[PDB]
Amino acid sequence: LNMSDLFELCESYYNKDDKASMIMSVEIVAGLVCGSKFMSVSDLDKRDTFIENFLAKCLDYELNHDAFEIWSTLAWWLPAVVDLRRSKTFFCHFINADGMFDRESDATHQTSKIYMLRSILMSMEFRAPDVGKLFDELVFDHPYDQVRQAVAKLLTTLVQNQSN
Amino acid sequence: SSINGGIVVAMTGKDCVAIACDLRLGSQSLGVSNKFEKIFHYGHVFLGITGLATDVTTLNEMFRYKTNLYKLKEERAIEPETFTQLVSSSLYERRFGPYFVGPVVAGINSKSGKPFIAGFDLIGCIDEAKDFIVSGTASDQLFGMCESLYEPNLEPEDLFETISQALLNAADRDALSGWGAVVYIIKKDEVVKRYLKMRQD
Amino acid sequence: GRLYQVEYALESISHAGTAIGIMASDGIVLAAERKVTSTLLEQDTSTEKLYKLNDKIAVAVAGLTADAEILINTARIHAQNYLKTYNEDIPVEILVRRLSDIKQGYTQHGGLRPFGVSFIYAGYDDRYGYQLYTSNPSGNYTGWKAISVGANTSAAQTLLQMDYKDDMKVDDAIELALKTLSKTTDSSALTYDRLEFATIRKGANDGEVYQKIFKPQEIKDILVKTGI
Amino acid sequence: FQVEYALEAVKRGTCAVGVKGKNCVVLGRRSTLKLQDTRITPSKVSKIDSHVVLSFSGLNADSRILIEKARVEAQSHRLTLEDPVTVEYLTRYVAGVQQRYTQSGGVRPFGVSTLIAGFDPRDDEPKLYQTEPSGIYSSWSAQTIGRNSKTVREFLEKNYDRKEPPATVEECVKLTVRIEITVVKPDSDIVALSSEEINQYVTQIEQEKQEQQEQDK
Amino acid sequence: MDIILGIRVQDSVILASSKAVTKDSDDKTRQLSPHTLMSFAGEAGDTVQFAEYIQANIQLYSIREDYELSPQAVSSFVRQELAKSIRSRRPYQVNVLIGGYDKKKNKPELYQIDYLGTKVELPYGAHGYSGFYTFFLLDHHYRPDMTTEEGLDLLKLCVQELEKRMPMDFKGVIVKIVDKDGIRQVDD
Amino acid sequence: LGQIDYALTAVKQGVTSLGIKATNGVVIATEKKSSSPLAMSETLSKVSLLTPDIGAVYSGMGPDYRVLVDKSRKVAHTSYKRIYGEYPPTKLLVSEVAKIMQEATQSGGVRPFGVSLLIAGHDEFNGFSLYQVDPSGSYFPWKATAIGKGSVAAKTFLEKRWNDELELEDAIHIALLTLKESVEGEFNGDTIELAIIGDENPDLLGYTGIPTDKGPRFRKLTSQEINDRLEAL
Amino acid sequence: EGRLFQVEYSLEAIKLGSTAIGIATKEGVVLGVEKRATSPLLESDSIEKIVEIDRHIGCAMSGLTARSMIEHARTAAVTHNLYYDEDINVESLTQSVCDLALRFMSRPFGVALLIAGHDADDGYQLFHAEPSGTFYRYNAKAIGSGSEGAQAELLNEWHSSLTLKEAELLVLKILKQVMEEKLDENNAQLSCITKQDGFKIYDNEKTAELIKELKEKEAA
C-alpha cells in the first residue's frame, strides 16, 4: 500500500449524515496519529499535511452536533494514549483557532472549539505546551451564556495546570 | 313489518340446495329500489331475511361480525346447524324486543355433505323441513306453489327451474314483491347466482 | 424520568424468540423461531407466534403468551367493530395505534403490570399499500422496511441492513429472512419444526389473499430450495 | 419526587420551538435508521383543529393521549356552543387535564410538555401558549422546549425583539435550528412545509453566513 | 312539507332542498366533508341536532386521521346511528340524502337513508311526497352519462312540476353541486 | 420469587397423577391418598367430568380443585353452550379455565390456585387432545405428561415409552406401570382413580330414540376393572 | 402522644411563594401581589395571582395558581344569586370555601387565600382562609415570603382611619420593603374592591403613577 489509501478511506468515510461513518473516519485519524512511531520523515510530513487539511476542512465551517461529540471524545482520548508532539499540525489547529474568543461573532461553534481545546489541555495538565497567550486572549464580556461558561471552565483548567 | 315487502324461498335437492329471493324495496305502495338483495353468505352458509329492511341490514352486519369472530377464535368455518342455533339464540335474546324479521338458513355441511335448510319465526323458533322453507309477505302463495310443484331428489338443473317458477308465480300475485329475482344454486364446491327476467320491471 | 417496569419488560422480551418482518415492493414476509422443546410437547398449538387479526392484517409476537392472547383478542374485536361501523376494513395504522394506546395506558396506571410483549404488524390497505410496524411495551409504534425483535435483535438488524434492497421481491424477502435467522440462532442449524412463516401478498387479480400461513411441509420445501 | 422526574423525562425529548409574528405563528425529528420507513410518519406538529395546532416535547405515547383529548374537547365545545374553541380555552383544558393527572398518587402524570399555537376564530391576533406538568400554563412570544432550551431561548431573546414583531411570514420561518415547520394564519389557515422548502431555507442561511464571512471574516 | 331531492350525474351530485320552514332562506344542508354533503328533512330541530352530531363526528375523524372518509363509510355510519336511534327512547325523525365524490375511485355517489335506517344508494332519490311528483321525469329523462348542465335542467323541470302539482308552497329551492373541486352552490 | 412460584412448589408437593394421549383416546390416572382407614375413599373423587367428552385431573390443593371443577362446569354451559347448542371443544374450555386461573392470579387480595390440571378431551375436527394448565394461567398441549411429587421419574419413563403408534390399551398399561412405580401407599383398585376419553358409549346416555345423539366419551373405570387390569401386570 | 402535625406543616406557608398583602379600609379593600421576574419576551399578563370571584368579591393567593377553590367560590356565588336573587356575604363565601376544603379532617387541601369583599351587612371585609378548613377575619394581612416583617409593619401602620389611596401606598411600601427595592411597575400588581366599582385590577399606568407618588412622598 502506497500510504495514501488510508487518506482516501478517511476522506470517503467522513459523511456528515451517518454518525457511524464519521466515527470510523475519526478512528482512522486516531490510528494515523497513534501510528507515528514506525514511519519515516517524509511519511510524517505527509501525515502532518493531511491532518492539517482534514482538520481545516472538518472543524472550521459548521458542526451538526453529531461530529462534535466524536471530535470531543477524540480530543479527550488521543492525548492520553500518545504524545501530541509527534504531530506538528494536530495541536496547532486547536491552539491557533481563529475567532474562538471573538466577542461580536454571532457562539455554538466558538463554544465547541473552546471545549475541544479545554479537553486537550485537561488530558495533559502539567506536561502541556506553553499556552499562556490564552491568558491575553480570554474574553469576559461575551454576551452569550454558553461562551461565558466555556471561558470560565477554560480559565479553571489553565489555573489548575499551573499549580503543580 | 310488512311495509317494505320481499319474499325468500329455499328448497333442498339432490346433494344441492337452492335459495331465491325477490329484489323489491319500497315504502308501502311506492317502489324505491329494484336492487335490494336479501340473501347473504358467511363462509359457506347462506341466510335470507325478510321483513323490515333496517333490521335485515342490522342482522346481516351482526351475523357477519359474529361469524368472523367465530372463524378467528375456532380456526374453522361455522356449519349450517351451529349457525342456525346461533341465530335462534340471538333472536331469543331480544324477547319482548324482537327484530321484525323472518330468517331462512340454507347450506351444505362441509363434513357430512348433506343439505340443510331451516326457517325462523319472530323470536327464533327453529323450523327444520326436509322439503322447503318460505318467508315473506307472499308466504301463502309460496306454500301453495311449493306444495304443488316440489319433488324430492331433484337435480340442480330441475331444482333451479322449480324454485324459479315457484318464486315468480308467487311474486306475481303479491303487490309488495316482484321487481326482479335472484336464485342461488349451491353445491358441494360450486355456487351459481342467476338473475331472472320478470314483469313490472 | 426512566420507567423501570418498561425496562424490565424490554429485558424480558430480549430473552424471547426472534421474529423478523421484511417488506417488499409487492408483499410482506413474517418469520418466527420456535424455542421451546421437550420431546413430548405438542407442536400443533395452532400458530404459536403468528396470529391473524383479520383477512388483511397479521401479527408476530415476542414475549409472554397470555398478554399476547389478550391483546390479539382485543385487536380482533376492534377490527370487527370498525368493519361493522364503516362497512370497510380497518386501516393498519389505526389498529396499531389502538394497541399502542392500550399498552401506554397499561404503563401509566398503578396496579397493572406492563405488557411484556413486542408486536410486529404486517398489513395491507388501499391508502398506503403494504405496511410494516413494530410496537413495544412503552406504547410507541414505528414503521419499518425490515425489522427484527426478540433475542438477537442487533445482529439481525445488522444482517438486514447489509443485504436489503428497496425493490426486492417476495421470494427475495423470504430468502433474506431465512438466511438472517439461520445466521443468528444459537441452535447450530435451522429446522422446519422450529420455524413459523407467513406471507401477505397481492396477485395480478385483485383478490388480496392475505392469509397464507405456511404449513410445516411448505416450510421444509422452502428451506430445501433456499439451501439452509 | 414526581413532577421533577417528569420534567427530566421532558428534557430528554426532541427540541421544539414556537414563535409568533405580526399575522402568523411558526411551530418548529431525529435521525431515521437505514431500514425505517418514513412514508408513514406521525408529524411532530399535530393540528388540533383548523385554527389551533399543537407541538409536543417528551414522551410521544403520552402526548398522543393529550392530543386526542384536546381534539375531542374541541369537537365537544363546537357541538355544545356552536363556536370553535379558542386558544386560551384549549390551553387551559390541557393544563387542567395534566394537573388532574398529577394528583392521585401520580407515578408519572404525563412526562410531556406542549406548545399550543393559533388564532381565535373571527380574529387575527396570534396566540402562543406553553403547557407543562403540574397544570402550569404560560404565554410566550418565542419559546423552546427540549434538549437545548436555554441556548435556543437565549438566541431568541437576543434576536427576537418585543418592539417590532416580524411583519412577513418568511422571516419568521427563516429561523436557524443549529426539521419541521408549520405555519398558522388567520381564517383557519394551516400550512405544513415540505422538505424542499426547508432545504431552500437552510441553503439561504448557509449562503448568508458565507457572505457575512466573506465581507468581514 | 319539505322537499329534498338528489340526482347523481356522470361526474357530479346535485342536491335540491326546500327553503320553507313552518322563513324563506333555510339551508337544510351540512358539509360533512370537503367532498361529502348531507341534506336532512322531517321533524323539528331533532334534524339539526342529528346533522350537527354527525358533522362533529366526521370532522373529528378527519382531524384524527388526516384523511377524509369515503361516502360509503359516511352513509354506513349514519345508517348505524339512525338504526340505534329507532330502538331507543327519543328517536330521531330525520330522512337524509348524502351526496359525495369518492376521490380514490373518482366517482360521484348518492345515498338515501330513511328515518328507520334504510339505505339504498339510488342513482336518483327524493324524500317525502316529492318522489310522487318527480319520479316519472327521472324515469324518462335520466341517463347514466349525463353532464352537470343536463342534470340541472332536469332538476329545474322537476322543481317546476313540484310547484305546479303540489298543494303545499315550499318557497323555492336551493341547489348544491358536489364534484372533484368540492361543494358549490348554484346561484340561479 | 412470588406467589406463582410458591403455588408451583405446593403443586410439586402434591400427589403425582399422569396423562397419556394415544391415537384413539386419552388416559388419565391418579392415586387417592387417605391415611385413615376410618375415612371412606369412595366419597372423594379426584377425576371429575367437565363435559361428556372432557375430563380433568389435578395435583395440588384439593379444595381449590373442587371449587375450580364447579366453576369450569358452569362456564362450559354459560359461555359456549346455550348459544351454539353443543359442548365446547377442548381448546376453548381449557382457555376458559386458564382465564379463571389468570383472573385469580391477577386479582388483588386473592391468592392463586395451588393446583395444576391435566385436561383430556375429544372433539370433532380436532380428534383427541391433552393439555396441562399451571397455576399462573398458561396452558400447554402434551402427548404424555405428569405432575406432582414423582413427576420427574414419571416424565422420564413416559419419554422412554411414548411413541406415535400407541393405542388406548397400551396407554392404560403404561399409565398403570407408571403409577405402580411411584405409589406412596398401597396399590390396589380402591386407591387408583383412572378415566379414559375414547369411543362413545350408547349404554350411558340413559335413553334411546334419537340416532344422532351419541353417548359420552368420558368413562371412569370401576374398582373391579382396575383390579382386573392390575392382574395383567 | 399523637397529634395532627400534617396540618401544622401545611400551615407553615411562609415560604409558599410570592408575598400577598391585603388592607381593608372604610372605602375599599386593596390587594397587592408580587410579580415574578421572567423572560422579557414572556407575556406577563398570563400571571394572575389576583382573581375575581364575582363583582363584589375578589381573591389573592401566594402559592401556585394551579384553581378548584376559585371555581367553587364562583359557582357558590352564582348559585346563591340564582337561589336568593341577591349577593352572597363575604363570610358565607369564605365558609363555603372552608367547607369545600374540609370535605375534600386530618389532611390539608388547597392553599391559603386572602378573600376580600363588600356587603351591606358588614361593609368591607377581609378574610384569611387556610388549607385547614378555617379562616380568620383580618384588618390587613400578609402571606408569602417575608410575611412576619410585613405583618409587623401592618401592626405598626394600620390605624382604622385609612383611605383607599393610603392603603395602596402602604401596600406598595410594604411590598418594596419585602422585595428590597426596585419595584417600578413589573414586580407588583394592585387591585381594589369598592362598593360602587366592584372588583377592579389596576393597569400598569396607574401602578406606575402610584409608584411615582410613593417615591415623591419618600423624597418629601
UniProtKB/Swiss-Prot annotation, chain B:
Residue(s) carrying Phosphoserine: S27
Top-level taxon of origin: Eukaryota
Family of the protein in this entry: Belongs to the peptidase T1B family.
Biological process annotations from GO: proteasomal ubiquitin-independent protein catabolic process; proteasome-mediated ubiquitin-dependent protein catabolic process
Organism expressing this protein natively: Saccharomyces cerevisiae (strain ATCC 204508 / S288c) (Baker's yeast)
Keyword Acetylation recorded: no
Function recorded in the entry: Non-catalytic component of the proteasome which degrades poly-ubiquitinated proteins in the cytoplasm and in the nucleus. It is essential for the regulated turnover of proteins and for the removal of misfolded proteins. The proteasome is a multicatalytic proteinase complex that is characterized by its ability to cleave peptides with Arg, Phe, Tyr, Leu, and Glu adjacent to the leaving group at neutral or slightly basic pH. It has an ATP-dependent proteolytic activity. This subunit may participate in the trypsin-like activity of the enzyme complex.
Annotated protein name in UniProt: Proteasome subunit beta type-3
Crosslink site: Glycyl lysine isopeptide (Lys-Gly) (interchain with G-Cter in ubiquitin): K66
One Gene Ontology molecular-function label: endopeptidase activator activity
Paired cysteines (S-S): none
A Pfam family: Proteasome
PANTHER family: METALLOPROTEASE TLDD, PROTEASOME SUBUNIT BETA TYPE-3
Keywords annotated in UniProt: Cytoplasm, Isopeptide bond, Nucleus, Phosphoprotein, Proteasome, Ubl conjugation
Gene Ontology terms: cellular component: cytosol; nucleus; proteasome complex; proteasome core complex, beta-subunit complex
PROSITE patterns, sorted: PROTEASOME_BETA_1 (PS00854), PROTEASOME_BETA_2 (PS51476)
Gene that encodes the chain: PUP3
Localization of this protein: Cytoplasm; Nucleus
Curated annotation (Swiss-Prot), chain C:
Protein name (database record): Proteasome subunit alpha type-3
Entry keyword annotation includes Phosphoprotein: no
PROSITE patterns membership: PROTEASOME_ALPHA_1, PROTEASOME_ALPHA_2
Gene3D superfamilies named in the record: Glutamine Phosphoribosylpyrophosphate, subunit 1, domain 1
Organism ancestry: Eukaryota, Fungi, Dikarya, Ascomycota, Saccharomycotina
Keyword flag Oxidoreductase: no
Species annotation: Saccharomyces cerevisiae (strain ATCC 204508 / S288c) (Baker's yeast)
Cross-link Glycyl lysine isopeptide (Lys-Gly) (interchain with G-Cter in ubiquitin), where in sequence: K84, K183, K215
Pfam families: Proteasome, Proteasome_A_N
UniProtKB/Swiss-Prot annotation, chain E:
A cellular component annotation (GO) from this entry: cytosol
Membrane-spanning ranges: none
Record's keyword terms, sorted: Acetylation, Cytoplasm, Nucleus, Phosphoprotein, Proteasome
Principal localisation: cytoplasm
Membership in a protein family: Belongs to the peptidase T1B family.
Assembly mode: The 26S proteasome consists of a 20S proteasome core and two 19S regulatory subunits. The 20S proteasome core is composed of 28 subunits that are arranged in four stacked rings, resulting in a barrel-shaped structure. The two end rings are each formed by seven alpha subunits, and the two central rings are each formed by seven beta subunits. The catalytic chamber with the active sites is on the inside of the barrel.
More details: Present with 21800 molecules/cell in log phase SD medium.
Name this protein carries in UniProt: Proteasome subunit beta type-4
Species this protein is from: Saccharomyces cerevisiae (strain ATCC 204508 / S288c)
Gene symbol of the encoding locus: PRE1
Curated annotation (Swiss-Prot), chain G:
Top-rank lineage group of the source organism: Eukaryota
Transmembrane segments: none
Gene3D superfamilies: Glutamine Phosphoribosylpyrophosphate, subunit 1, domain 1
Phosphoserine PTM sites in chain numbering: S39
Pfam family name, one: Proteasome
Location of the protein in the cell: Cytoplasm; Nucleus
Biological processes annotated in GO: proteasomal ubiquitin-independent protein catabolic process; proteasome-mediated ubiquitin-dependent protein catabolic process
UniProt cross-references to SUPFAM superfamilies, sorted A to Z: N-terminal nucleophile aminohydrolases (Ntn hydrolases) (SSF56235)
List of residues that carry Phosphothreonine: T38
CDD domains according to UniProt: proteasome_alpha_type_5
Gene Ontology CC annotations of this record: nucleus; proteasome complex; proteasome core complex, alpha-subunit complex; proteasome storage granule
Keywords, ordered alphabetically: Cytoplasm, Nucleus, Phosphoprotein, Proteasome
SUBUNIT field: The 26S proteasome consists of a 20S proteasome core and two 19S regulatory subunits. The 20S proteasome core is composed of 28 subunits that are arranged in four stacked rings, resulting in a barrel-shaped structure. The two end rings are each formed by seven alpha subunits, and the two central rings are each formed by seven beta subunits. The catalytic chamber with the active sites is on the inside of the barrel.
Family the entry assigns: Belongs to the peptidase T1A family.
Listed PANTHER family: PROTEASOME SUBUNIT ALPHA/BETA
NCBIfam families, alphabetized: PRK03996.1
Additional observations: Present with 17100 molecules/cell in log phase SD medium.
Name of the molecule in the record: Proteasome subunit alpha type-5
Taxonomic source organism: Saccharomyces cerevisiae (strain ATCC 204508 / S288c) (Baker's yeast)
